[PDB]
């Protein structure tokens with residue numbers, strides 16, 4: 001598949017970087033191997049595929065192997081975002097496996113090393129994410145230099161600078177929104193635009209278009225396409241994060257409420273509760289972000305569906321997907337791209353995991 | 354001066370990036386401003402100046418303003434290394450000022466925000482360092498694209514990939530050396546080669562040569578020059594870190610012993626004590642890395658000078674500086690570069706701060 005072809009290009013790159021760094025010893029090599037295992041250990045490769053479809057939309061052909069490696073840099077950049085997000089959220093596990101800070105704290109304990117095991121695991125996790133990010137940029141630098149016309153390089157760099165600036169801004173805005181207890185739908189929408197719309201949809205698409213041709217019309221259209229679809233993707237995550245079945249999502253039931261995230265769905269519930277039951281709005285305001293029992297969580301989930309926040313979320317998702325498909329249909333891109341991205345937009349809007 | 358010209362090029366770049374990101378709101382803007390204040394808030398600009406002299410060594414002229422901005426990327430990359438090092442070391446202050454995690458935890462408290470103030474400060478500090486590093490690479494990408502011949506770009510990228518790979522490896526090796534209690538002089542020398550020789554001397558020099566011309570002879574010579582001088586720089590830090598006067602160094606007396614660093618000087622003291630007093634070696638082995646009173650620290654410092662570790666360190670510094678000046682003198686570079694770098698090598702070898 002195309003995800004597998006992009007994965008193989010990343011697998012070969014990391015193996016080369018790992019061999020070239022072997023002179024730094026077996027401890028650093030074990031760090032690089034742990035990065036390999038984490039990156040190549042599966043995933044949908046959603047962001048590289050968005051770059052692939054952004055390439056097909058305005059290109060006459062299929063891309064060279066080096067351009068697939070450029071797309072794979074989004075996957076390595078995502079490892080950086082995830083590794084540092086696990087430190088930010090203080091998560092113990094990710095997709096069933098221990099987070100980096102726990103793996104390296106356990107390595108510390110297994111060898112009866114001195115000092116705090118948790119300080120070591122946190123330090124090593126910082127450096128692991130840092131490594132993923134410098135190597136992700138090394139891919140962009142190397143592919144640009146050796147495989148792209150100088151015009152394609154300039155367009156690729158502008159997208160590369162935007163995607164990393166916007167994901168960093170989205171992360172900081174998100175932790176500020178939780179700390180300041182920003183209730184508004186606008187605050188959550190602003191974070192979703194940077195963390196989901198830009199970082200997951202719009203900028204990946206534009207990376208592919210930038211690598212293919214100078215199509216400023218298509219770049220601006222994918223901005224509007226990613227704005228609707230990304231917010232639809234985020235709202236889907238918010239519904240799953242509250243009402244998802246753990247056997248289907250793999251996340252604990254009502255994880256967003258347990259973790260105190262400031263989502264659009266939660267923000268809309270507070271607004272709808274102000275309209276229909278002030279005491280229900282008071283329950284939400286004074287419970288979000290606090291240590292909740294499983295009873296409190298189930299109670300808050302019923303209140304969220306009660307005030308109609310779930311129905312409003314599902315209505316928004318349909319509307320944003322419809323307008324995203326409308327934007328995609330009347331677009332000066334190849335019909336093959338229109339069909340591929342319409343498949344993705346439907347899957348992202350209506351999934352259960 | 355040249356440090357001021359490089360600083361001004363960085364000041365203008367960050368102001369441009371900050372204006373271009375203003376649409377993300379006042380909270381992220383406050384983060385960018387804090388990065389400005391930290392980077393531009395002083396410094397010797399040692400690594401950019403090494404890139405400057407590496408440029409003069411093989412160039413017929415003085416560099417364009419954009420090439421000075423490329424040199425300033427080393428200063429922004431250093432902000433990343435310092436911000437994440439403060440999290441790794443759990444330092445409360447740096448050069449008199451609060452570290453990032455303390456500034457942002459205090460911002461959290463000042464606004465009566467919710468959650469853990471320290472978790473927020475740690476999260477914000479991670480993102481601050483991340484920002485400095487993506488923007489440092491954005492400088493290298495932008496200057497390469499718009500100011501360098503494609504041959505100069507390829508040489509610059511190879512140095513850029515090495516310096517960030519080696520500083521990351523040096524950091525990980527350093528925390529592994531402290532956790533595993535690696536006593537040997539070789540372990541400390543290995544860390545010093547990556548953290549000091551490569552990251553501070555060799556790679557900065559090579560960045561300047563790479564931006565000027567294809568002089569593989571000079572690049573290999575600066576590798577040998579930075580190997581002697583960097584280890585001399587590190588040994589100077591180790592002596593200051595144990596025997597430095599706080600009024601002169603600005604660090605607390607015997608900071609390296611208080612912080613439990615695995616330095617060459619400490620490693621040599623354990624080896625010399627094995628030779629002259631096993632019980633003194635036992636005192637060092639069982640005290641390094643532990644919580645020490647000020648009496649213990651002063652006792653350990655006397656033991657270090659007793660076994661002659663300080664004299665051995667000062668002898669090594671003179672020898673490495675002599676061979677570094679010998680390497681510099683018989684080098685196919687401009688005589689102006691030879692005089693400038695000889696000034697730096699003397700200052701780095703014999704300083705008190």
Ligand SMILES: C=C(C)CCOP(=O)(O)OP(=O)(O)O
Nearest residue numbers: 081082085089167171195199
């Ligand atoms: C891409 C970024 C910035 C983080 C990825 O993790 P998520 O965004 O899915 O995780 P939470 O913030 O929901 O915990």
Ligand SMILES: C=C(C)CCOP(=O)(O)OP(=O)(O)O
Nearest residue numbers: 434435438442520524548552
């Ligand atoms: C460049 C790097 C990796 C860190 C800079 O700080 P120092 O190296 O001077 O700090 P310590 O490790 O001695 O605490």
Ligand SMILES: [Ca+2]
Nearest residue numbers: 085088089174
């Ligand atoms: Ca998070």
Ligand SMILES: [Ca+2]
Nearest residue numbers: 085086089091
């Ligand atoms: Ca998370």
Ligand SMILES: [Ca+2]
Nearest residue numbers: 195237238261
């Ligand atoms: Ca999320």
Ligand SMILES: [Ca+2]
Nearest residue numbers: 438441442527
């Ligand atoms: Ca340190």
Ligand SMILES: [Ca+2]
Nearest residue numbers: 438439442444
């Ligand atoms: Ca330090």
Ligand SMILES: [Ca+2]
Nearest residue numbers: 548590591614
């Ligand atoms: Ca040091």
Ligand SMILES: [Cl-]
Nearest residue numbers: 231316317320
């Ligand atoms: Cl909406």
Ligand SMILES: [Cl-]
Nearest residue numbers: 584669670673
């Ligand atoms: Cl030596």
